[PDB]
Symmetry: C3
Subunit: 174 residues, 3 copies
């Protein structure tokens, strides 16, 4: 029994993120470089600010033939009063990936399955579709609005950007 939940992760450059901790003996990213990060999170339909992403990217290797990096990522997605989802897996700057859903809290207690990561604009816009199993209830309607198809040009609704009650969930994470 799968419930799809899609969200847009956007770096609006106002959270001091990403923070690069440089250790690799390379001008390029390399093993040793650690990247704590936190970006804003919006609903799949771009109408509401829900919260944030928060966690750690561990650089694994630069991939020169793909013109990108492989990170191993451990982080959570915060949904204001509703709770959160946690993930572990590959973040490849150069292609879509699937991460494991390691669990959740709140309405996400019991969550499991995988989530597809699509990078739209490096590094500032990402789109995700969680294929959620194990939820106690149907997801709230304000989170399951039909998603905006992902494109380079997507923007949150101005109400969501401006943090108006119509453009946020209750206690949205910040």
């Amino acid at each position: 029994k799968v419930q799809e939940l899609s969200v847009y992760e956007i770096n609006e450059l106002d959270r001091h993120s990403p923070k690069i901790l440089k250790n690799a003996f390379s001008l390029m990213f390399g093993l040793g470089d650690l990247v704590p990060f936190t970006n804003k999170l919006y609903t799949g339909d771009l109408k509401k600010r829900v919260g944030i992403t928060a966690g750690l990217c561990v650089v694994i290797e630069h991939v020169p033939e793909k013109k990108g990096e492989r990170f191993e990522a451990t982080y959570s997605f915060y949904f204001g009063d509703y709770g959160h989802l946690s993930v572990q897996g590959p973040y490849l700057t150069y292609e879509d990936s699937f991460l494991a859903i390691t669990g959740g809290a709140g309405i996400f207690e019991g969550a499991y399955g995988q989530v597809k990561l699509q990078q739209l604009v490096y590094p500032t816009k990402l789109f995700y579709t969680f294929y959620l199993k194990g939820l106690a209830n149907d997801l709230p309607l304000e989170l399951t609005g039909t998603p905006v198809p992902p494109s380079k040009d997507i923007e949150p609704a101005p109400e969501a950007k401006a943090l108006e009650p119509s453009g946020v969930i209750s206690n949205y994470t910040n």
Copy 2:
């Protein structure tokens, strides 16, 4: 289905912990700062030493209006030869939170659900209630004694602190 398990985490300052790696742009905690840690773990009734917590807090932001920090935490709870529980989620220095139970080993194989984290004395005393689903069996009686109600004043039993046989589980983690 839900088996509730409570434990006290106590920092007794004898494990080199916390170790603060301070990298942030700020004088206060900020993104970039990392805090590997390990504390002692006692049963919910405070009668027995069970083991340790072990993992990493990733600083996400300072929260000036709440006089405290938001961390993203990834860590495990060790119960001697019984096994361990793993978690991922928010640790807020100023209020309670819930973390995802990401999995378990030993008697905790198959573990899922969420855990409530209550801070009792910052930073040395914390109380957790795991709402455990998925376990193959009823939890052993030595781990499910009636919890001491959480307060600022709790202490582990003097026999547990002193690592006497009556105050430890067999091969308690250290």
Copy 3:
């Protein structure tokens, strides 16, 4: 319900791994020390390269009485186009341990359970046995060949080491 899967992890010294981030005051490993890593992953029968391991070891304590270290490990095992498995738990340099399976993706979507970690040569050769629950299908035959007897002398098939078509899985992770 339970499907067993063994793999060999081998550091062939060509991936810049491990990377020791030294922060503890001591010449020996201690809390503060972080070790990003990535090794090669082969089938338990050693006939095929499947992919890699990738993640972070957090040093928890040195254990003088065992002449070794305790790490807390967060990492994934990559199986090419099959997907991946993610884990959280203890790596002890001086004895076998079990880690938690936190989830998977691809064929390993919905994966849970635990994995045994057995060190064969510190730290270049390890042998794993996953006890996998939650999988949609039986594991593919090319991953379930009888394991080579674990020892310090194990080596990948020469076709596997040389990346010949007959010694790799489809789109093996690198």
